[PDB]
């Protein structure tokens, strides 16, 4: 019985990591999109603000 | 939809009803989930009472009926009028005074 509990517990530890890493590597890609979309918007929005001084 | 309704039994010109808990979309006289009581519409008269007063015999398991009304059972208009007399629900209809 101890082998089943130990074997099952280790299986959960392998999942939480595979889930956190998967979610982590996903937020990175979602974060890069925010960058490319921000540099363009910021460059386009600051331009207008620069013509209203 | 659970409903507290009546199942018409008896013979021709001798109506007799079962107060039952059944799903709305089922046959009137099909075996219900529970039989909460009985209802006799024809009013009776006490044997040795010469006053002329009549009464109606109605057997009802109030404790079992309150649980179904509490979980969301929908009694028909006839069963609603009965449950309002015993003092469980409020009447749906009343005699206009004006």
């Amino acid at each position: 019985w101890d082998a089943k509990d130990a074997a099952k517990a280790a299986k959960k530890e392998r999942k939480v990591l595979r889930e956190k890493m998967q979610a982590a590597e996903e937020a990175i890609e979602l974060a890069e999109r925010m960058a490319r979309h921000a540099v363009r918007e910021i460059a386009m929005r600051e331009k207008i603000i620069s013509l209203q001084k | 939809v659970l409903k507290l309704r009546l199942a018409r039994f008896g013979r021709t010109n001798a109506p007799f009803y079962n107060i039952v808990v059944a799903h709305a979309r089922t046959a009137r006289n099909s075996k219900p989930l529970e039989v909460i009581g009985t209802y006799d519409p024809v009013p009776k008269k006490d044997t040795y009472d010469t006053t002329g007063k009549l009464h109606k015999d109605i057997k009802l398991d109030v404790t079992r009926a309150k649980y179904w009304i509490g979980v969301g059972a929908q009694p028909t208009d006839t069963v609603w009028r009965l449950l309002s007399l015993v003092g469980i629900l409020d009447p749906k209809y009343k005699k206009p005074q004006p």
Binding site: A23, A24, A27, I28, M34, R45, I49, Q52 | -
Partner: protein, 48 residues
């Protein structure tokens, strides 16, 4: 001086400057949330 002068001086330069800055404030809010979310995941990895 007069209504026409004061009314002509006023223009959309202030209104434009306000709308653009406001859109950037909500933009930084989306970045702040995203940057915050990454922190909630960074401390969990090194934790486990």
């Amino acid at each position: 001086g007069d209504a026409f002068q004061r009314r002509e001086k006023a223009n959309e330069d202030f209104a434009i400057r306000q709308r653009e800055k406001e859109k950037l404030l909500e933009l930084k809010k989306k970045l702040a949330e995203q940057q915050k979310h990454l922190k909630t995941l960074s401390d969990h990895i090194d934790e486990i």
